[PDB]
Amino acid sequence: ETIASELKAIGKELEDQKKEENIQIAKIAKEKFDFLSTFKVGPYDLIDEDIQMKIKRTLYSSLDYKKENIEKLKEILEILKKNSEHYNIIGRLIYHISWGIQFQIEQNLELIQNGVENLSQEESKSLLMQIKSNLEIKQRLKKTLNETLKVYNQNTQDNEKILAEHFNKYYKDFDTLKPA
Amino acid sequence: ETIASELKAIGKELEDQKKEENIQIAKIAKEKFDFLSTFKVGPYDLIDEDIQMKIKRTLYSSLDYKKENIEKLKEILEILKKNSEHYNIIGRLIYHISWGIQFQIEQNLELIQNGVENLSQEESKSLLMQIKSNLEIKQRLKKTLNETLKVYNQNTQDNEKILAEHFNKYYKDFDTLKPA
């Protein structure tokens, strides 16, 4: 106390975030653009529903459950998936970060659900700090995926510009063609 | 004579080219990757079978009837089609150049089929020159589409490189994320 009051309030906050994401994720599954349900890094990779749920929670939250952004992320991952050298860095985002955050959050929610009374003044202090660090990461990631989408959108746009300048250079007439 | 011998020979050559392209085009329609059959520049554009045939002859010849290249051209045109500002330059390639070449070739084949005897020494000289100029253009274009495909392949490759360096920069760990 009053860390016990702070913890119960931040626990209720996290449980609300979880309830709204459960609803928002359910609609994406019906609207049939839940790519993470079928997403494999390698080819012969097995998919666990519980692990995927946590990944969906992180990735669809950071993209504000927007179909446009969710599809664009699918496209980005599909591009990198082509080269087996990118398999590790995809896993860093999908597992270590996206699943990792939710895994820590579940553990933190459980300590609150178990009872804040069963925790010492030092344990209570650390739990509040940990929750705040995880919530900060959940935002850090959101701001990173935004930059990722900006990088992908910029490249798409640049490709159109380059193709257009090439077309205007060479296809103006018969005389603008490359020599035989 | 012997321009009459040269013309009858170059006419037979053009008729063989036409016969082999007719076969090669027929197989593309069976293997269901003949995008030009359904290709519109604008949205409400009407498609003429005879005009399209000539476009198919030029474009599928230049790409050596390769499915990979034919699909890549479809992708390039689809990208530029998004902006109405690129509608004119697409038409320069599709109609003025691709249909235009075949239209001139048909006229040249007809003058040979009509009879080289019904042509003066000056008309015979000009027809041979014209045929050679058109055959040179058919090569000029082939060497341009090759560069077009190289530009598109380079852009695709550059996009993979950029996305990879972005991923390794920001998704290495939790600490490599963008701070708030």
Numbering used by the authors:
A (entry chain A), B (entry chain B): 70 to 249
What sentences appear in the manuscript?
CspA (also referred to as BbCRASP-1 or BBA68) is expressed on the surface of B. burgdorferi and binds factor H and FHL-1 in the region of domains 5–7 with an affinity measured in the range 10–30 nM. The atomic structure of CspA is known and consists of seven α-helices joined by short loops assembled in a ‘lollipop’-type arrangement. The dimeric structure possesses a cleft between the two subunits within which a putative factor H binding site has been proposed following in vitro mutagenesis studies.
The structure of CspA from B. burgdorferi has been redetermined to 4.1 Å resolution in a new crystal form, showing that the bacterial protein exists in a dimeric form which is highly similar to that observed in the previous crystal structure. This leaves the structure of the ten C-terminal residues (240–250) unaffected, supporting earlier evidence that these residues are required for the assembly of a stable dimer. Further weight is also added to the hypothesis that the dimeric species is essential for the function of CspA as the ‘lock’ to the second subunit is unaffected. Despite flexibility in the dimer organization, the C-terminal lock structure is completely conserved, suggesting that these interactions underpin the assembly and therefore the biological activity of CspA. Flexibility also allows alteration of the binding-site confirmation which could enable binding to different complement regulators, perhaps providing a key role of CspA in enabling B. burgdorferi to evade complement-mediated killing.
